[PDB]
């Protein structure tokens, strides 16, 4: 019924437990990744929703919900030598998809 | 132009050295994680193959 349906995406902590997910709110990490929903399908099961890592957020306390786009991204003004490392990073990434 | 190209080769090569050296130090600082943790990983992979 909302004009902008949405879903948040967080990452689970160690020892996943559905009962704790409904009992306590600390199992979910303070990090959350809010994103807009695309479309439901439910071909076989009644719940096959799609999720995305779109807007990162770190709620200060999910138990308390307030949120802010604290997408920290500090970068040095000279963006010439910082990308030299990127060639090795992509070369590593290329080696993972290549060898594996 | 050949000297300017040499000075650019100096700056670019010294830059590749600082990037390779910072990356080498940074690889050693990953290598500071103990080998016990690696063998423990293999123990975990031995258990990972327990399905």
Curated annotation (Swiss-Prot), chain B:
What disease is associated with this protein? CODAS syndrome: A rare syndrome characterized by the combination of cerebral, ocular, dental, auricular, and skeletal features. These include developmental delay, craniofacial anomalies, cataracts, ptosis, median nasal groove, delayed tooth eruption, hearing loss, short stature, delayed epiphyseal ossification, metaphyseal hip dysplasia, and vertebral coronal clefts.
- Which tissues express it? Duodenum, heart, lung and liver, but not thymus.
Recorded domain comment:
The Lon N-terminal domains are crucial for the overall structure of the protein, maintaining it in a conformation allowing its proper functioning. The AP-domain (ATP-binding and proteolytic domains) has a closed-ring conformation in the presence of AMP-PNP and its N-terminal entry gate appears closed. Upon ADP binding, it switches to a lock-washer conformation and its N-terminal gate opens.
Q: Could you describe the subunit structure of this protein?
A: Homohexamer. Organized in a ring with a central cavity. The ATP-binding and proteolytic domains (AP-domain) form a hexameric chamber, while the N-terminal domain is arranged as a trimer of dimers. DNA and RNA binding is stimulated by substrate and inhibited by ATP binding. Interacts with TWNK and mitochondrial DNA polymerase subunit POLG.
Q: Where in the cell is it found?
A: Mitochondrion matrix
Protein name per the record:
Lon protease homolog, mitochondrial
Q: What does this protein do?
A: ATP-dependent serine protease that mediates the selective degradation of misfolded, unassembled or oxidatively damaged polypeptides as well as certain short-lived regulatory proteins in the mitochondrial matrix. Endogenous substrates include mitochondrial steroidogenic acute regulatory (StAR) protein, DELE1, helicase Twinkle (TWNK) and the large ribosomal subunit protein MRPL32/bL32m. MRPL32/bL32m is protected from degradation by LONP1 when it is bound to a nucleic acid (RNA), but TWNK is not. May also have a chaperone function in the assembly of inner membrane protein complexes.
Q: What family is this protein classified in?
A: Belongs to the peptidase S16 family.
């Amino acid at each position: 019924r909302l004009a902008q349906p949405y879903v948040g995406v967080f990452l689970k902590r160690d020892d996943s437990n559905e009962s704790d997910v409904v009992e306590s709110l600390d199992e979910i990490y303070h990090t959350g990744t809010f994103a807009q929903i695309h479309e439901m399908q439910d071909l076989g099961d009644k719940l096959r929703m799609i999720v995305m890592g779109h807007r990162r957020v770190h709620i200060s306390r999910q138990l308390e919900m307030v949120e802010v786009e604290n997408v920290v991204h500090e970068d040095f003004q000279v963006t010439e030598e910082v990308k030299a490392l990127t060639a090795e990073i992509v070369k590593t990434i290329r080696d993972i998809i290549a060898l594996n | 132009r050949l000297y300017k190209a040499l000075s650019l080769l100096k700056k670019e090569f010294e830059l590749s050295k600082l990037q390779q050296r910072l990356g080498r130090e940074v690889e050693e600082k990953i290598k500071q994680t103990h080998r016990k943790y690696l063998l423990q990983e293999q123990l975990k992979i031995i258990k990972k193959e327990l399905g």
